[PDB]
Short mmCIF file of C-alpha atoms and ligand atoms in Angstrom, two decimals:
data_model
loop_
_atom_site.label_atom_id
_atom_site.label_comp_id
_atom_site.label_asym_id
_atom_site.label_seq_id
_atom_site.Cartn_x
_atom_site.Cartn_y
_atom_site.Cartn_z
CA UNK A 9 2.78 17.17 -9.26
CA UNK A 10 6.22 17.04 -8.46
CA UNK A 11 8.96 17.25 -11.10
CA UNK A 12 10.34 14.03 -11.11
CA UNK A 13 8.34 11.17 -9.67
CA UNK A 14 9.98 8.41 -8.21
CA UNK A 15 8.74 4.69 -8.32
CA UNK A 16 9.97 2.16 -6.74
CA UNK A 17 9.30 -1.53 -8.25
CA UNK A 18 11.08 -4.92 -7.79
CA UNK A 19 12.73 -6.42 -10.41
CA UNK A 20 12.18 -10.08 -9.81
CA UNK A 21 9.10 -10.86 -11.20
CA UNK A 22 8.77 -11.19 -14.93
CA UNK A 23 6.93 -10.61 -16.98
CA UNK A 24 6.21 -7.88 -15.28
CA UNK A 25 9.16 -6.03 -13.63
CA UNK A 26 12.42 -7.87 -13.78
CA UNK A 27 16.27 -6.67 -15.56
CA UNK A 28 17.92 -6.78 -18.88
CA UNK A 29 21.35 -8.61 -19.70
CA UNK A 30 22.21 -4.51 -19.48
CA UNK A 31 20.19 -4.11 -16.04
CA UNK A 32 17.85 -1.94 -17.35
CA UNK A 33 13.97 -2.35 -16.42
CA UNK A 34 11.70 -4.23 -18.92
CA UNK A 35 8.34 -5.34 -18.30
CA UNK A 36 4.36 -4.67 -18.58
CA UNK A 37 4.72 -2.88 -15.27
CA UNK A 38 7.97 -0.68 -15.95
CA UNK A 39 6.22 -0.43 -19.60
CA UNK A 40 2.74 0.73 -18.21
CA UNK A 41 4.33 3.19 -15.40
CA UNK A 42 6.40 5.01 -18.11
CA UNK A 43 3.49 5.33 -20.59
CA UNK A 44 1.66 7.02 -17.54
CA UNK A 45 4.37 8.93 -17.06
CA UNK A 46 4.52 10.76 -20.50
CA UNK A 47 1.17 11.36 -20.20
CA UNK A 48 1.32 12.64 -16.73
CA UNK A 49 4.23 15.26 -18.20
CA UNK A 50 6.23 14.28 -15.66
CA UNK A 51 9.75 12.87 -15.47
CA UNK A 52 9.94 9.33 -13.79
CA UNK A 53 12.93 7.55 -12.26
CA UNK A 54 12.23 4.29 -11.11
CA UNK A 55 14.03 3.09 -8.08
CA UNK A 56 14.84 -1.03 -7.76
CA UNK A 57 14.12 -2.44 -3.96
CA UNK A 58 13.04 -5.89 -2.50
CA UNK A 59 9.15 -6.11 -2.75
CA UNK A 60 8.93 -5.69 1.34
CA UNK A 61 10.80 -2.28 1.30
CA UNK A 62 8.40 -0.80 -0.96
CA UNK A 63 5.73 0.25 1.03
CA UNK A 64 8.22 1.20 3.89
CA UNK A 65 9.97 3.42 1.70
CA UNK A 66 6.66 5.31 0.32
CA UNK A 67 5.70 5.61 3.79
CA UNK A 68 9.03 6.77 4.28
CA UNK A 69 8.85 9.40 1.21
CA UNK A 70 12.00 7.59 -0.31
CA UNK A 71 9.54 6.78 -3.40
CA UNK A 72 6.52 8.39 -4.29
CA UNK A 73 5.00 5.79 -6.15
CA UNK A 74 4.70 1.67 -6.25
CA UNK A 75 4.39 0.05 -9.35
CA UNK A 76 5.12 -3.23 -8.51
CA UNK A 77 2.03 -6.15 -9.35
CA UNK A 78 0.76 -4.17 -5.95
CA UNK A 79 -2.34 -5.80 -5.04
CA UNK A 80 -4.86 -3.79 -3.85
CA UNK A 81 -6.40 -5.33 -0.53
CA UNK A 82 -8.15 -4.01 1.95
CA UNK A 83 -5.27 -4.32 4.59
CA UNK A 84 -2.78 -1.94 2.58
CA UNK A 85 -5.87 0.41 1.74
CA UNK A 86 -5.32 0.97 5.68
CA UNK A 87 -2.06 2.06 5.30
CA UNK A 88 -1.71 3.70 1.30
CA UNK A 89 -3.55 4.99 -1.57
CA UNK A 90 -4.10 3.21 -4.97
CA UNK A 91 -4.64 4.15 -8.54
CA UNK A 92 -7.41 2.43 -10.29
CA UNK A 93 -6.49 -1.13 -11.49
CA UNK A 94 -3.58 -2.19 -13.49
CA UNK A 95 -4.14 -5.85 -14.29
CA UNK A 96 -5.68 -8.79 -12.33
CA UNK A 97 -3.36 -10.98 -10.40
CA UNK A 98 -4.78 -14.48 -8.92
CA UNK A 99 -2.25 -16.84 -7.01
CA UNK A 100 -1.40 -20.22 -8.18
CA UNK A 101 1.28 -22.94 -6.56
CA UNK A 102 4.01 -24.34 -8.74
CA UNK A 103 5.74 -27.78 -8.01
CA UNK A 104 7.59 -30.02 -9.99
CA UNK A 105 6.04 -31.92 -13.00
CA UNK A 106 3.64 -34.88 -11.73
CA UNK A 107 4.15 -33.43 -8.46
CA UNK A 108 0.59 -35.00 -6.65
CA UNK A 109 1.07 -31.05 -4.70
CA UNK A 110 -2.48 -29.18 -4.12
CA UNK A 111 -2.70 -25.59 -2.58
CA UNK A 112 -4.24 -27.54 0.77
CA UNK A 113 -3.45 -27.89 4.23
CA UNK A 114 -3.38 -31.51 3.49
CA UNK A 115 -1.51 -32.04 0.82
CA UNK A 116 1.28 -29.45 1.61
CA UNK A 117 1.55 -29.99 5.53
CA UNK A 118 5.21 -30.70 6.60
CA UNK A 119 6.23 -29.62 3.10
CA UNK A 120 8.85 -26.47 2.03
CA UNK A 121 6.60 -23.70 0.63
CA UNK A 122 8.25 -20.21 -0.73
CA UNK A 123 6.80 -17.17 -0.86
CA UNK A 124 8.39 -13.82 -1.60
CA UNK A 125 8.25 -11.57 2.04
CA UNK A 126 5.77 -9.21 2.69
CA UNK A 127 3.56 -10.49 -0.52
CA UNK A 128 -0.17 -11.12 -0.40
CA UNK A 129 1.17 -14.86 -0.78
CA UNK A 130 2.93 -14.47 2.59
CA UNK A 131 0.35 -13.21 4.29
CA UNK A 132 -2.18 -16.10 3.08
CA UNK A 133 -0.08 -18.92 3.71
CA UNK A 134 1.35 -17.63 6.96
CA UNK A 135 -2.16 -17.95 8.67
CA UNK A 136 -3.69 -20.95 6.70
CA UNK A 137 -0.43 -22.90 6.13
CA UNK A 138 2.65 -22.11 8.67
CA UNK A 139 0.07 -21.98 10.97
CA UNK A 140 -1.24 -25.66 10.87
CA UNK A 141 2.44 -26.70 9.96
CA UNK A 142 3.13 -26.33 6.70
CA UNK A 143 7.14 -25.12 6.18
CA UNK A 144 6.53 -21.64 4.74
CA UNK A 145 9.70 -20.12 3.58
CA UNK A 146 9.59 -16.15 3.06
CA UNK A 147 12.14 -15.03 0.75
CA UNK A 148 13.51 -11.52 0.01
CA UNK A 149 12.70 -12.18 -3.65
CA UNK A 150 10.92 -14.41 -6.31
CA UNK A 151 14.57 -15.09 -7.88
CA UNK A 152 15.78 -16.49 -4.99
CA UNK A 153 12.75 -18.77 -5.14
CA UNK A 154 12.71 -20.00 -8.42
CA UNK A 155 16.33 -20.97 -7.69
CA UNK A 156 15.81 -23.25 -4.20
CA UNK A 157 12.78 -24.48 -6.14
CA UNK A 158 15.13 -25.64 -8.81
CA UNK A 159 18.07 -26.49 -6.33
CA UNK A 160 15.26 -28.83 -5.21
CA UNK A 161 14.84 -27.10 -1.20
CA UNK A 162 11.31 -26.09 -1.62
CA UNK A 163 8.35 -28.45 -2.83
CA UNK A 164 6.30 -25.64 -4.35
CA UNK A 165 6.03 -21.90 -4.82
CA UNK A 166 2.63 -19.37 -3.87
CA UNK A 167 3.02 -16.09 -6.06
CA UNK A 168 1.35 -14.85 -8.68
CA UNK A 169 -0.18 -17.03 -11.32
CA UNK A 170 0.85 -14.76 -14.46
CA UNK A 171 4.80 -14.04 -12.98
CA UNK A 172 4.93 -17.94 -12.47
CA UNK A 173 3.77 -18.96 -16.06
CA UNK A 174 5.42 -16.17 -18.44
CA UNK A 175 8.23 -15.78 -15.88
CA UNK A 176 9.74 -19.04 -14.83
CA UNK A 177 7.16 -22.24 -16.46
CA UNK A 178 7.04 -20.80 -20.30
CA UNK A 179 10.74 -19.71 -19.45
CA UNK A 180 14.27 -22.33 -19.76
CA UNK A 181 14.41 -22.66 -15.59
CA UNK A 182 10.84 -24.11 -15.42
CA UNK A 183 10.24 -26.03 -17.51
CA UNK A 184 10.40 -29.04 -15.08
CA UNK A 185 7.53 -27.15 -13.17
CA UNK A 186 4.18 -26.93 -13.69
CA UNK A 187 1.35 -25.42 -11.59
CA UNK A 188 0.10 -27.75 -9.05
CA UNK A 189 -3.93 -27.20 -8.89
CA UNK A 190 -5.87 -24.50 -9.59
CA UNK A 191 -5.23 -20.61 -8.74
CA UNK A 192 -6.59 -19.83 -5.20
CA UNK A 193 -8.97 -17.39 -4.86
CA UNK A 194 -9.43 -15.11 -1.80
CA UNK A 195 -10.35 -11.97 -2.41
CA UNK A 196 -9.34 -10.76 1.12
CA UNK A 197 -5.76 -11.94 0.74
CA UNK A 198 -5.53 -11.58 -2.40
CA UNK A 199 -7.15 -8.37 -3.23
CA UNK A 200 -8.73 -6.71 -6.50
CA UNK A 201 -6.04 -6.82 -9.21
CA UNK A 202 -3.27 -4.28 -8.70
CA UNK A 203 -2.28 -0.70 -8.71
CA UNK A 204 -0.19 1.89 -8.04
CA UNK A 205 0.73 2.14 -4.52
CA UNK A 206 0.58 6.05 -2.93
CA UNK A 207 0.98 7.77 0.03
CA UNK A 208 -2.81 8.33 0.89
CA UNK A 209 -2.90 12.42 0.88
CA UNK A 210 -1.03 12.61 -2.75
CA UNK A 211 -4.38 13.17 -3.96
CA UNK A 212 -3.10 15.13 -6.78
CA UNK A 213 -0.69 12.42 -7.90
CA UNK A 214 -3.41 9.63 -7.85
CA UNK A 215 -5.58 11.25 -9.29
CA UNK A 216 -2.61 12.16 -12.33
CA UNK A 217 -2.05 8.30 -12.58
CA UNK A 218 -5.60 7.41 -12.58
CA UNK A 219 -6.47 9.89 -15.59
CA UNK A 220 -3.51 8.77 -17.27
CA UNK A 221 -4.46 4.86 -16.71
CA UNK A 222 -7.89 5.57 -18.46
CA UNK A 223 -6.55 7.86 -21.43
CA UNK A 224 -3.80 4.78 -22.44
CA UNK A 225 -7.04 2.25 -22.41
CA UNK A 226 -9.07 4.42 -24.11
CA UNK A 227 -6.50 4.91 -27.15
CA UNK A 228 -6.05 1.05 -27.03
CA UNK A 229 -2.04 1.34 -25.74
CA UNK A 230 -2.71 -0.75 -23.01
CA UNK A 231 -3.79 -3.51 -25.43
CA UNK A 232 -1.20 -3.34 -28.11
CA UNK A 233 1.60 -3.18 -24.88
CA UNK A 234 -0.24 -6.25 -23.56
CA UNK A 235 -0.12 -8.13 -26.66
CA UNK A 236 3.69 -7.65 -26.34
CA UNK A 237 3.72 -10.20 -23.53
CA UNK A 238 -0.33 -12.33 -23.20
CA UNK A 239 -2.46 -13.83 -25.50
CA UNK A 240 -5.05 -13.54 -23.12
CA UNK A 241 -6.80 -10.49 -21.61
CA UNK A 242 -4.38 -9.63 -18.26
CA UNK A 243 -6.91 -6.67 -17.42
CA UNK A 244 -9.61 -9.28 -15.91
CA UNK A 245 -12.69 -7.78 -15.08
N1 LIG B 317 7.46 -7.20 -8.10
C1 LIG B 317 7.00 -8.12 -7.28
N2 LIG B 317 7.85 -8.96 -6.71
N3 LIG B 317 5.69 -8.17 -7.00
C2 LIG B 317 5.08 -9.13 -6.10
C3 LIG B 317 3.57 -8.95 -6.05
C4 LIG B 317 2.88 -10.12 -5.36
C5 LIG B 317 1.42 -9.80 -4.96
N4 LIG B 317 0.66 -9.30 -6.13
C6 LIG B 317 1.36 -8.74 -3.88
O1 LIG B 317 0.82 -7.64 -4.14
O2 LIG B 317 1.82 -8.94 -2.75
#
């Protein structure tokens, strides 16, 4: 491995990844990454970006890592490596309360949809919603959706179910929101839970995270950190 390991990670989606009143990382993701990272013996500095410059910059060998609620689809498996699963992540919309909104062609066409750029929720509405008409919005990050949600410019938000609820419904900006219909499954969009992201011949590194990832759910760490944030079980399957 090398000596310091460098992971890159957006800090716009709580409860996962998002910033202190100080600026320093907090989250399940920032909390699960370090606990690998003492395990691993390795030093870890983790590196802030918008969510679309991630892959570009491990590609780029500006990071060496993702941690990021990086789904693991088929598509990126083209292009990177992943550890073995971190959590599950479905998708669910978010509109205002008593909002009649439904994550369909019909209900949503000619409407303002956000979704954070190059996201899993991009990439699904792009071809089954801007497509056909819907007005999908791609922003550089979930903050700045939240906020033209609020601001009252978008009709609804696609990103992950968890991030909306702990991050923004259960939080003091959402609770006018609520999710509008069910989570939408697609498990070629949407992938198989996360991971970490990885340049495809760090074989040695994925293979570092993925022993690491087993030992802290053997010991029971990952559920006490979970508890921290869920009453429910965020592993999934
Ligand atoms: N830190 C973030 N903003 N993460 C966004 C992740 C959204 C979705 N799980 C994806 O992999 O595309």
């Amino acid at each position: 491995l090398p000596q310091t390991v460098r992971i890159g990670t957006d800090t716009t989606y709580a409860p996962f990844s998002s910033k202190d009143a100080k600026g320093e990382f907090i989250g399940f993701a920032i909390d699960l990454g370090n606990e690998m990272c003492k395990r691993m013996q390795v030093k870890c500095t983790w590196v802030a970006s918008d969510f679309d410059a991630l892959i570009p910059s491990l590609k780029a060998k500006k990071i060496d890592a993702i941690i990021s609620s990086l789904s693991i689809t088929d598509k990126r498996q083209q292009e990177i490596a992943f550890s073995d699963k971190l959590y599950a992540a479905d998708s669910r919309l978010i509109a205002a309360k008593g909002s009649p909104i439904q994550p369909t062609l019909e209900s949503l066409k000619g409407k303002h949809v956000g979704v954070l750029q190059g996201s899993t929720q991009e990439a699904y509405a792009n071809d089954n919603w801007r497509t056909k008409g819907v007005d999908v919005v791609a922003y550089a990050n979930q903050d700045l959706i939240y906020s033209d949600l609020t601001a009252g410019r978008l009709d609804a938000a696609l990103q992950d179910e968890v991030a909306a609820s702990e991050g923004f419904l259960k939080q003091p900006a959402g609770k006018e929101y609520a999710f509008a219909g069910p989570s939408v499954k697609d498990k070629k969009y949407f992938g198989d839970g996360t991971g970490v992201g990885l340049r495809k011949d760090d074989t040695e590194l994925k293979a570092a995270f993925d022993k690491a990832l087993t030992e802290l759910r053997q010991d029971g760490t990952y559920d006490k950190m979970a508890k921290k944030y869920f009453d429910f079980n965020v592993y999934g399957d």
